[PDB]
Design a protein around this ligand. Structure first.
Ligand SMILES: [Ca+2]
Ligand SMILES: [Ca+2]
Ligand SMILES: [Ca+2]
Ligand SMILES: [Ca+2]
Ligand SMILES: [Ca+2]
Ligand SMILES: [Ca+2]
Ligand SMILES: [Ca+2]
Ligand SMILES: [Ca+2]
Ligand SMILES: [Ca+2]
Ligand SMILES: [Ca+2]
Ligand SMILES: [Ca+2]
Ligand SMILES: [Ca+2]
Ligand SMILES: [Ca+2]
Ligand SMILES: [Ca+2]
Ligand SMILES: [Ca+2]
Ligand SMILES: [Ca+2]
Ligand SMILES: [Zn+2]
Ligand SMILES: [Zn+2]
Lengths: 313, 98, 326, 101, 326, 313, 98, 101
């Protein structure tokens, strides 16, 4: 599918908050504290509920949202957690992860507290609701769970990224575990098929806190519209002979190289820590071991396929 | 994105101050435009989008904050005639083309 | 000396905020978030300045102030710090630890960042200002410091308690480091003799956050008026024969015993409280930096095991094709 | 208005206050021990001493709307209580002082 | 006050030991290893008790003692500790920090292990003993402690310096924490007023090591006799006209300048000195606990790479056999 | 080969030092400090030389020595290092790693300081000498090195173990890296063939320190005599019917189990740290990953062999 | 390793004190011998060697330390007639056999 | 015996002492500046002040056998030097005091 960036349903730093103290094109309410770097949807205080919801409604047949967030806790047990909603109307208040109940849409819940006593939490649960089913907070919505994966997203050394994609009546939740600073290191967590959501709806995020307290920070929320490769009209003869791009690109690369060169000697023209650097090196080593093992798995799968092709003869 | 909004020297000149300090009031129209494209891409992706342009035209330099409808209208008018690949992003190919 | 508790210059939990979300007898400004349990004067966000000051001026010759606070940060180095002021005017906004510069009073600064580069932070710095000296932020105020002591008050399992006592023109700052849950385990930090402060002044406490981020929570702020043992008038013949005091004391003790006995069988008759011990809420920063690393191993192990079975199957089925063909 | 007898002797408020922890409502209590329950339930710090902050919390309260008292007014009631009950000038109120008035 | 250096109760480098391997004017006993740079009073071995005491008794009304020492251990928790004594008799062997119990004097104990289980260690404890009180080792001496302060003196990039000053019946202990290489950056730790000590006593310093192991090195021990500014007799007319002092001072300064200038071109004329900066000698314990972990990864990487090439060859040659047969 | 334990040429804790202050059957001199747990051959002081040498001479055709030692340094650069000697006479003093020069035998040098300036150190170097060649300290004996391996043995979390085996005119040095507490996790470091050493010689250890200072502790030194499987006479009919061993073994196992049971309830009859336990868990995880990778390598080598057997047909 | 050196009760009785305290003065000759074999194997390998036996017969319980030649002679006489597999170690099979 | 003139004016000892760091032997120096070299080379702490410990190190010395002085004897010479040269009763010896005798 082809991706189109949508600014109207997106917030991002480092200029997240405008001069008047609000995030553009989004409505926040409750205990959410918007800052330049991030939005603290629920601070580490007792009984905090917050939510940031979009102002205008979105008409997207297929969409994709990339959410970067951190959940930071002092202890090993946290409450309550974060939630990402595609609804029909902004709740902006309520007991379901800081947002209203009886929502008409889809809600991805990053539950951190195990109210069912089954050791499944922390979990990422996909729950859809037409508007007549109450969310079961006392058992983490296990009976109403369309899909669930058991991944940890608390106190990670790097911010946790999540890609939620709705493309041709199926919803896929992919999770970056947060052990690497790469922004394209997603891993499969859950998926559901034949998912029905309204074409008109509001994108939003929310967080709730119970007795135990976490900081629920959201750094970015990028909403992308996905269009099918065949349904999109090409509208040709609009690139303007295609030659000016090739005349401009190398000049701009040369100028950015010379700007980097200027910054190189102006950094020292007029003027990391030990242990932290060692921790970064340790995490890079773990990531390199992971990449090597994955590459070995891919090579062995190629080995698999080739042996089977020989087997067929 | 009018021509005079980007072809003014004092704004960019006080903007690049702090890291690079080369006062030179003989910049070509494609030079200060390039600087404008360089500094406003905060993510470092060499690409401009709706949020970056919205923070560019509002900025922090008194005057009342602009209306949300007016900002949406002007940024939609900018993205309608400047974006050619319909990617939601603005590149210097499209930026210098229009 | 003799201590009298002063409610009009104090706040404490677990009902710190009223129904309208304001602290009684106190005015808060900046990025302070007053909750029921505590007041988060500066949350762990970039460029946050907050302060909570008294509404009414306090005219005390001698006084004692007990502050319970937590400074919690993710990293080992924190920013910016906390400050407790006895000033002349209010200090709601400013650049000096979230409070205004050029104050006429005394400010005890809990500094967590070493701007001077002398490796003497975190520290408790006593600075007196008549109203004409600017606070030197870039040198941690070491040039105009009346006294200092080098203690750490960040990332402790128990809240850090501090006593600031002005008595006979001597300001004594004593610090409980918060390693133990004892509320009376104070240790001497600093003192300033012949300290001059205004007779009437506003109490307050402020917090600022710089490039690094810490949460600066305040759980209690207890103010006591101190009177000399000789200057206090006794005013006798007011105890009303002292006999009903002894007739009520044992009744009160028996009521406590009866209530405790009743709670003893009603805490376990219907056990539904989850509970939260202090062991499950505290973890050292470096230990955390180890635990994640351990978690970073638990992923890799999985990618071995799957890979293992893959090699195993390229064993098994191959043998079959080996067995069948030969 | 202040620390009146009927405000402390209200059995319904005491019974609805001890719910959750004390699960035994009995409508025969004498006007003596409900004062003990009031004193114990309004001392949050566990030090068996009522100060101005705890008394202000009791007087202002939240019971489920009702308008809140002014800060000057609440200061007036708290200062009137302290000036007429705190015999030892300690700031805190013992049980003997509470039973005196 | 006025300070006079006393050589007979002092030792320092870089020639601390004589040709026969003994410290001048000092007697060492136990497991002490006197070297040229320092004295290792207790090495990092299990059950080591050592002490170095003065040979001649010192009769000072007021005195000041500066001790430079390092306590270096592998783990975060150390054992047992150090002690500086001004006693009546020598304390060569015993159970109290490597020194004998029931001493008639004053002992400043640097305790690194918390036997009482109160999380108040490491600490500097001032204990005075007339000769009838046993040291309570299992409770860290908190019952009979005259004063205490909570400082950390282990695993520092620079040696820890301590000043013990007895002046007008007041014993003041000030501590330089050793984060900076400044030799005059002391901070107040504790004081005891109306302290009673014998008029003549032996100086000494001892160290003990328990279950955990630390090295207790002492680089210097400087003793000063303190005289009151009014009680010291000036004895004038002894400067011999003071003119040759000024005639020699500029000559000495010129000699220093000439020697420095000569060393400036002879340090680089034949550069052969390897050098050893302080950055290459200091590393935090936890950082070490990280670095080894990083090294633990560098092994595993190798076992991947070899394994990688093995799979690669079971690619390559197989293709040949695939290519040849089909 | 068959192994025989030799107590006369061995020292070991936890009773290493006798009542009179000396190690049995061994002679120590210099700055070596013998303790109950270990022998500190060279403490962390400037210009320290120590050595512990055996009293009686050993007549072993083939032998094997297992040495457990730690080298602990405050900084990242250390000097001078440890040495294990099989000589003809005890030097007990000298400038070659705390022992004499012109030794008649074989010396394994654990050099930690790079005097040659080639970044090869720390290294384990095997140097033999008839008694006429001086050890080249200024370049770590690179010209006279019979074999060398580049392994790090400083500041390891666990004591470093080393097996030196001389069996049928070849000397093999195997090194445990010290990342695991296992005593049988040796790895190949170096070997030499046609090595000639005198049949009469003294076993010894030594350590030296320069400007930079390390603690050189030796925890154990187990000397084993290796005999060929064919040259050893069986001398049968000496097991005494072999039945009493089977009658005694299960009874002794039952009694040691019941003694463990008694100790179990007497441990709690009358009565590790966080972070240290986490470090132990991290090192155990690294060891388990290493073991899994080695097992995968062995399985792939089996795969190799089997494919080649099929290839032969 | 004489019979009376191992068949005495007070030494082992004061030896097991601290961890296991069961005073029982009716021990069989194979019981206190077993305890003697158990405690003197410090390495936990369920096996006795020359060093462990040498520390056993010297011990820390005054009397002058024994001669090195005498200790070598007595331990060699012990190992000569007790060890059967010529392993350099002493097991309870060999220990109870002789 | 003590801090005699010939002990400080010995050019050979000064020249063999400055070797390694000062690589310039010249046998024409006046009896003035070799005292400066002695004072600078025997002040190890760099504080330009000679105390009893540094003087004892200089007097006892190691030059490559020779028997060492007794502790009472060394105390006698050091105390005789301090009693006759330390004019300000500081314990330390300045260069002016050294040049006085
Ligand atoms: Ca939940
Ligand atoms: Ca659950
Ligand atoms: Ca951009
Ligand atoms: Ca575009
Ligand atoms: Ca600061
Ligand atoms: Ca500072
Ligand atoms: Ca109370
Ligand atoms: Ca009262
Ligand atoms: Ca202790
Ligand atoms: Ca203690
Ligand atoms: Ca070397
Ligand atoms: Ca080398
Ligand atoms: Ca054994
Ligand atoms: Ca055997
Ligand atoms: Ca000096
Ligand atoms: Ca002088
Ligand atoms: Zn109520
Ligand atoms: Zn000399």
């Amino acid at each position: 599918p082809h991706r189109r960036f949508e600014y109207k349903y997106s917030f991002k730093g480092p200029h997240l908050v405008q001069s008047d103290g609000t995030v553009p094109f989004w409505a926040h309410a409750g205990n959410a504290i918007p800052s330049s770097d991030q939005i603290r949807v629920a601070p580490s205080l007792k009984s905090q509920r917050g939510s940031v919801w979009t102002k205008t409604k979105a008409a997207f047949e297929n969409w994709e949202v990339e959410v970067t967030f951190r959940v930071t806790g002092r202890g090993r047990i946290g409450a309550d957690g974060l939630a990402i909603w595609y609804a029909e109307n902004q709740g902006l208040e309520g007991p379901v992860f800081g947002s209203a109940d009886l929502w008409n849409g889809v809600g991805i819940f990053f539950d951190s507290f195990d109210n069912d006593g089954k050791k499944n939490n922390p979990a990422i649960v996909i729950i859809g609701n037409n508007g007549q089913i109450h969310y079961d907070h006392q058992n983490d919505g296990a009976s109403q769970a369309l899909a669930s994966c058991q991944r940890d997203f608390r106190n990670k050394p790097y911010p946790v990224r999540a890609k939620i994609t709705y493309y041709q009546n199926t919803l896929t939740v992919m999770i970056n575990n947060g052990f690497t600073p790469d922004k394209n290191d997603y891993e499969f967590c859950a998926k559901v098929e034949n998912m029905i959501i309204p074409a008109q709806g509001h994108f939003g995020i929310s967080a709730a806190t119970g007795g135990l307290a976490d900081d629920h920070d959201v750094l970015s929320f990028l909403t992308f519209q996905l269009t099918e490769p065949g349904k999109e009209p090409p509208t040709p003869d609009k690139e303007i002979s295609e030659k000016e791009k090739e005349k401009y690109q190398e000049e701009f690369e040369h100028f950015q190289q010379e700007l980097d060169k200027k910054k190189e000697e102006f950094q020292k023209g007029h003027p990391e820590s030990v242990g932290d650097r060692e921790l970064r090196q340790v995490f890079e080593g773990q990531n390199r071991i992971h990449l090597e093992i994955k590459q070995l798995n891919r090579q062995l799968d190629m080995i698999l396929d080739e042996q089977r092709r020989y087997v067929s003869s | 994105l009018d021509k005079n909004t980007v072809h003014d020297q004092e704004h960019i000149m006080e903007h690049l101050e702090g890291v690079i300090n080369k006062p030179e009031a003989e910049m070509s129209p494609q030079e200060l435009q390039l600087h404008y494209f360089k500094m406003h891409d905060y993510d470092g992706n060499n690409l401009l989008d709706g949020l970056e342009l919205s923070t560019a035209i509002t900025h922090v330099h008194q005057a009342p904050l602009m209306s949300e409808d007016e900002l949406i209208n002007i940024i939609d008018g900018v993205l309608r005639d400047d974006d050619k690949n319909n990617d939601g992003y603005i590149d210097y190919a499209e930026f210098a083309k229009s």
